[PDB]
Amino acid sequence: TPAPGPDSLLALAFPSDPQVSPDGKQVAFVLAQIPRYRSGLWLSEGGAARPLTHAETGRGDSAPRWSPDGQNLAFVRSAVKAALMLLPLKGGEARRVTHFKNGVSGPQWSPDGRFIAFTTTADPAALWLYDVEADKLREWYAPEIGIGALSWWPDSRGVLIVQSEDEWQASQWRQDVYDLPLPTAPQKLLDWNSAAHGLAPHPDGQRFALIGRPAGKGNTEHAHLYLIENGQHRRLDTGHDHPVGDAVGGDCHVGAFPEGPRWLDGDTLLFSSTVRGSVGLFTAHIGGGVKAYDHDPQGVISAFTANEHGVALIRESATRFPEVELNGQRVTDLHARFPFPVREPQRVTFETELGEGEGWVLLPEGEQKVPALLNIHGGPHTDYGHGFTHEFQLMAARGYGVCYSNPRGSVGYGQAWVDAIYGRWGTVDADDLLNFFDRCLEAVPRLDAAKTAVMGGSYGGFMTNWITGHTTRFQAAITDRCISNLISFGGTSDIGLRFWDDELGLDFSRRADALKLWDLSPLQYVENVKTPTLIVHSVLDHRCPVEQAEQWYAALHKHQVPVRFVRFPEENHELSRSGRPDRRLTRLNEYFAWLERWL
Amino acid sequence: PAPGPDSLLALAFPSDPQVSPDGKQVAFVLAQIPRYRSGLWLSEGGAARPLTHAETGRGDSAPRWSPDGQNLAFVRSKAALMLLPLKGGEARRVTGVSGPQWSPDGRFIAFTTAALWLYDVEADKLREWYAPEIGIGALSWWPDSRGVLIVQSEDEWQASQWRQDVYDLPLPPQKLLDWNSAAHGLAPHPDGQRFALIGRPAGKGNTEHAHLYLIENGQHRRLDTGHDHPVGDAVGGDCHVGAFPEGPRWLDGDTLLFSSTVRGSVGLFTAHIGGGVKAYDHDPQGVISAFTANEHGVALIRESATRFPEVELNGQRVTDLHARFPFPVREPQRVTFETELGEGEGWVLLPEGEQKVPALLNIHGGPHTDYGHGFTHEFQLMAARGYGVCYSNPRGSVGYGQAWVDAIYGRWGTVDADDLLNFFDRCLEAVPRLDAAKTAVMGGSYGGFMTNWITGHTTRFQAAITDRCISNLISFGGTSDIGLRFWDDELGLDFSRRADALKLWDLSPLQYVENVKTPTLIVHSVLDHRCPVEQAEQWYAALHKHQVPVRFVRFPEENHELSRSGRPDRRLTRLNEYFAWLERWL
Amino acid sequence: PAPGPDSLLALAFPSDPQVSPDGKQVAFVLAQIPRYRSGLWLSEGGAARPLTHAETGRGDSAPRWSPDGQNLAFVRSKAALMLLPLKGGEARRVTHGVSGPQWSPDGRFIAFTTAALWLYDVEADKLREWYAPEIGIGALSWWPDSRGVLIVQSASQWRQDVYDLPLPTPQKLLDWNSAAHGLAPHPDGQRFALIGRPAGKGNTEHAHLYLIENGQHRRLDTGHDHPVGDAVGGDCHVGAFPEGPRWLDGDTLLFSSTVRGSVGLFTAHIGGGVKAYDHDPQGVISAFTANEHGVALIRESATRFPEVELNGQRVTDLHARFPFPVREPQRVTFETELGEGEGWVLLPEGEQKVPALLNIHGGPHTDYGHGFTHEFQLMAARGYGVCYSNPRGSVGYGQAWVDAIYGRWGTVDADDLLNFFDRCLEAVPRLDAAKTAVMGGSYGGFMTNWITGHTTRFQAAITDRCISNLISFGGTSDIGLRFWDDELGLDFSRRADALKLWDLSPLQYVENVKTPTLIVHSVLDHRCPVEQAEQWYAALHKHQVPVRFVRFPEENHELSRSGRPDRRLTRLNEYFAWLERWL
Question: Which one is the CATH code of A346-598: 3.40.80.10, 3.40.50.1820, 3.30.565.10, 3.10.580.10?
């Protein structure tokens, strides 16, 4: 194989949205491939998947949904903003069902096959109803704020929806669950006043489960499963100190990754959960605790669908590119496209007062000394571990030892491990990262202690700024989507009004809290930074406004610290958004150019 | 039918009064109508007549007389250098560009397009003269046309610290003065060797009054001695659209004509190589906003608090622009206040009638500018709509001596806030028609800083309007295109040093936002580079979290859009929002 | 509320009925809505279902079965060759426009034009220019062994020859020097049939079927004094209507023929003799495809909108879309020296007197009769009696009936029309003799001009695509260099002939016109230049005869060409507005 660069990405095709058929014998999914990525629908009955559609313009085809009789796929086509299409599987081309200027999203068949629900802003988005037997469209419900999760009752009488009832509740990021019957006015079904999604109606047609957290708990509380009966709730995934859903890092997720829990029978609810850098499938039981269903402690199930007859999912590991499965049988050959050899991480642990933390080292070929790159994951409440990271494999392929760990604050090690950083970012988390990095240097002698770098995105950018402001040990730093000034973030971020409240118990608009936010701000200590720093940031970032990067740039420049500031016109996750890989390639180019210059 | 913001559209705006070499004519720029477009106008002593017309683009600007008086060079809008014969015929396109200047002998026209280019007049050829690494500041031809003096910095860092030097660039660049400080307005002496400049020497921070310096063989001596006031117009007024030249001009070998701001006025003065400063044309109740001069004549633009800007040539008004003002203008009354530095002053502009009127405390920007005797359409419109307008020059203002400037150094929000509230109370005592129960506080730039500061320290105002505000001095240092220098000069504080940043936080209105109860309108441009919108976003988000009634107007057009493109939309919408907010709360 | 021209927009139009190789399926084209766009439909014996769904452009057309029955090639609208698998999945685009796709019988190639003849290698997925003609390629058919194609090419005299063109790695095969199309290669890979007439025949001679063997020709459809192909009027044909003869076995050649206002399927047999295959004397088979396993076709009548059939079973429901009740014509005869002529009267509902509209078909060598005419049904629905006949000059009544007008248009053909119309007034008492109109297109416009210049009896006239001056037509029409030589034996560039052409010109008699006349014409008409209509307009205007001249920017047959019904709707509006104004 040739010498790998960021271009290696262009050899890959990206799977998404594994939708098992009602009879459990087929999987329809989305594949994005090549410059611009476009997506088309693929199908497998057990063997090698075959293409069903092919896109030549626009973003392509997405969101395949089986008709209950298994004879049709509804899907969304972008070529035409996002049009609802209807494709017969036994022959013929797809028909365009909607003709809205702004397109639709989130098609869901009713279980009886009579309706397709979707949302659109037509010409907040409204919920519309497609009458299948009459080939007619009709607005179903116009929410005051907007519709979150939505699921049909198993008897097709209507849908459960999550929404905020007014802007007061909406401004607190709180929602409730409503019953909306088919039109001929939604009644409230749960006074939740909290976070809810992933509605899973019980087969009995009356109870339902949800994913989220009750009102009393801040949003650092693990998302859990709650059974709802007659307005009452009880926790369903008991004895399982881990969140619902995939929160493991990986950079080969392009498209939608469904994770909605599914009832396998009247007692058994299938769900995915993040456990120590892995994501496995588990079952929660009305009558008991949580049991493993399909959990590889070294792997990540990133999406799944299921019914009483079959299961389809996407699987990956730290050494295996994402693949689509149907009932345990791999139906894609996507890892074979990975254009250079992958390497196997080595685990390195470190001690904390809450117990042992873990991380990994990925080494290049050979035995000579190599630079050591400390990478810090974002969140902070995510995990590194067993997702596939093309960037990490590429770094080792280009001769760097990659060190990446789960400090306290990470999400897969229990609620207490999350809670350890509450209100005090830059204390125990910085300790754990530097303690871990020292353990890497001690455990792997070929790691060159004189050629080290620290880097990360989002909270990893906050932490890179913090660390370089508290030690000069690193020869280079790369801070991505960083935070430098916690005060201004509170006023500029589109989540600033709540993020510090949830994560730190602090309100930037309260004087005493603001001083504590400033004491947690890396910019306060910028006068200590001597490490050459590459700064990467989107100009239009709404979650983390570019003012955060501008302040770090200006401060380092004023101290005449070598600094370089890359301002992307594309927002983050552009590859998943539009299929254009330019942001990813340019970012990786800048990363290696900076490391080649200083390491 | 009380007048509204639409009243602006009745006005035409003069700029750039250029006297002819013979001293007997003036060419200038007039912007008129919806979109303002500018054309060249000319007067030979009487009422001015139009020379060019424009239906597309921004129009024509920068008229420059050929030394023989027979042609006008000018810039037409991408932006072409044009040549117009004055005795008949239409203009020829010669070359966008900016800043045309004839050589005194008429052989060349220098301009920038940025690199400095040279147009050979007798050969009708273009040629790149000098392509700077960083950029060219002020530029003036030597009187013998051998070349130009230029101002430029040594690198990008020195430029961000506002440190510059003067270079000699002969016709097809050697350093001529180790200035290492702020310099513009180069005025070469008639002897072809010495030159004057406007600025301040290296040891001085930028809060020091700009002064006049004679340069000889690398040495400098201050020329405008015995005159504790800055060079140039630094007085507020909102009817200046276009360029307002203020370059000093040698009237003879001893006499350098310049403009200076003095207690809310701007006058013309002369500096003498062998003495101090003498008044040349200074009305303490008027503002001379632009001028040109030579040994044969003087042209200028003049205004007052009650007179819209007019163009003059040798003391004779040649325009009729005040007559266009569509409602009656009113006369302010002066109100004083006391400080440890002496008496401060401000003014109150009252509506017609005898009833109680709401009282609007307006705070000028800068902070080192003056309110006073500029013409402010916004203030006249406010009075025409029934509001009492109170506007003053607190310590920090620029026209009352260096000590008055220095009083706020390092401590914005102490004596300047005192002076504004002191002045406002004195307005309420001296003007019985001001309604003490219906008060508002408002200002732009530093005045927005001060509106945020004041409402965070007293609840006395019933409404507040904060424009181009500053709320967080720390983030300003990192986001503003003047942030690497502004707090160093104004406060002696460096946002990138820990101890200084804490002091910047103590001076930040955002620290005290929890005390704000006054309903606040926030006005800000989304693309503001001098004062990034993050400043306004923090004040908006904080007031909203405290459930203070707040409204945030985000303009897609940058400030001074009227001067930039001729589009009055920003001016009209802003005034609409201002009065709507005052109507809602009084 | 009486139905109006908008009634057209309720209709969907079938075309190109392609039987599958195994004879068990039909793929065809359906054009529906404003603009008509076409999509592919498929039937396996039952109700047809849509295969493609075009929302922009003209749509999808020209479906062609792969010999293995698993794929349809087709053309998508610039105009790309597409390949659709029938057992699941969407179509693949094969080219970068094209027309006339034809599979080789072995399935290895698809020929098309893009104009030059191009070749698509199926097993290699490659395109290649096959032959770039100096003048152009007419009919084209593969030899049954896929070694190559027979092509027709030259031209202004409409004389062509047949060439053999093998696969690349054209020789002339018949000195025909005459009109030829519809090549039908015999199964033996050696002989082939064509449609046309030999060199000695003028183009008013009935087109017939000729078997070609070693450069020799023998007429195959003997004992059958009628032309090959559909030459019957009807206005609901949008798209392509294949009529190529097909060998059912080594002895049997299936073809369509026009007989007295009908079009039927017949078989010619080697050694001669014609037999009826599927011929209803009251119906029109407008298109068909066939092989040894099955037949698909489109069928219609004067009272039945076109429907697609497969092996005798109707697979569409298009007549049910017709938005007002259809009425049944009544037959009226008239006598001539050549025997009995015939026409029809279509009456409105009720019992009152209604205006009488004499409509004259074009050609002149076509038939009125048993095609479906929306315009005629709409006329009756709006209160008019429609009278339409087949005078001498018509094509379905034998060669002698055609030849009777040769060289003398405006003599026996005008006689027969007025004779027929008088018989209508006598036989149908509800026809109002004081509210009569005369109207027709092409040759019918010539005849409207001729008639109104020789009698004042009509209260209104509508002349469409008319001819007024035969002399200038000879020089301006893209068929002028031959049309009068074939139809009249006159050459406009010869002095004595030109004077005879002037004496046959309606414009010579325009001083007699008193009838209010609507003139309808396309400005860009190449077959019948608009100068013809301008002269009639100017002459009537000079005489202050009430006249209205509608100049269409769209050429004739715009609906079938582009799918835009604007010309059809506007033309019908103008027709009725004029009849309402004058009766």
Answer: 3.40.50.1820
A234 interfacial to chain C (CB closer than 8 Å)? no
Scanning the structure block, which residue is given the tokens 């893009």?
A: C114
**Overall size of chain A counted in residues:** 599
> Which tokens is B201 given?
């020497």
Output DSSP code: residue A428. H
Question: For the range C483-487, what are the long-range contacts, defined as Cβ-Cβ under 8 Å and sequence gap of 24 or more?
Answer: C486/C202, C486/C203, C486/C204, C487/C204, C487/C406, C487/C407, C487/C409
Tell me the resolution in Å: 2.3
From chain A, the residues in CB contact with C90 under 8 A are 52-54, 87, 93-94
User: How many residues are present in chain C?
Assistant: 583
A500 close to B (CB below 8 A): no
C86 Cα to chain A: minimum distance (Å): 5
Token pair 């017969």 in the structure block, residue: A88
Return the closest-CA partner of residue B331 out of B310, B304, B309, B357: B304
The single-letter code of the amino acid at B18 is Q
Peptide bond into B367 cis (omega under 30): yes
Per-position b or e across B301-328, b if 16+ CB within 10 A of its CB:
bbbbbbbbbbbbbeeeebbebbeebebe
The answer to whether A555 contacts B496, with C-beta atoms less than 8 Å apart, is yes
Q: Residue C123 burial by CB count (10 A; 0-12/13-18/19+): exposed, middle or buried?
A: exposed
Is residue A90 within 8 angstroms of chain C, CB to CB?
Answer: yes
Active-site residue, C442 included: yes
Amino acid at A36: R
DSSP line for B87-150: TSS--EE----EEEEE-TTSSEEEEE---EEEEETTTTEEEEEE--SS----EEE-TTSSEEEE
The CA-to-CA distance between both ends of chain C, in Å, stands at: 19
CA distance A290 to B392: 73
Active site residue B140: no
Q: In this complex, is the C-beta atom of B156 within 8 Å of any C-beta atom belonging to chain A?
A: no
Cβ–Cβ gap A89/C93 under 8 Å: no
How does DSSP classify residue C303? T
Using DSSP's 3-state secondary structure scheme, residue C537 falls into helix
Instruction: Give the C-alpha separation, A204 to B222, whole Å.
Output: 94
**Alpha carbon distance A143, A120 (integer Å):** 12
Q: Return the exposure string of C302-339: e unless at least 16 CB atoms fall within 10 Å of the residue's CB, then b.
A: bbbbbbbbbeeebbbebbeebeeebbebeebebebeee
Name the burial class of residue B174, with classes exposed (0-12), middle (13-18) and buried (19+) by CB atoms within 10 angstroms of its CB.
Answer: exposed
Collapsed DSSP state (helix, strand, coil) of residue A569: coil
- Contact assessment for residue C364 and residue C443, using Cβ atoms and an 8 Å cutoff: yes
Determine the 3-state secondary structure of C228 from DSSP: strand
State the helix-helix crossing angle for A459-468 and A428-443, rounded to 10 degrees: 80
Q: What DSSP string runs through B233-254?
A: --B--S---S------EESSSS
Length of chain B, in residues: 586
Tell me which chains share at least 3 CB pairs under 8 Å with chain B. A
Token output for A460 = 């990893």
Q: Are A487 and A517 in contact (CB under 8 A)?
A: yes
Kindly provide the b/e burial profile for residues A397-435, where b requires at least 16 CB atoms within 10 angstroms of the residue's own CB.
bbbbbbbbbbbbbbbbbbbebbebbeeebbebbbebbbb
In angstroms, the CA C196 to CA C209 distance is 7
Structure tokens at C205: 């001679």
Distance CA A546, CA B532 (A): 11
CA dihedral B227, B229, B230, B233 (to 10 degrees): -120
Question: What's the start-to-end Cα distance of chain A, in Å?
Answer: 25
Chain A: list its partners (3+ Cβ pairs within 8 Å): B, C
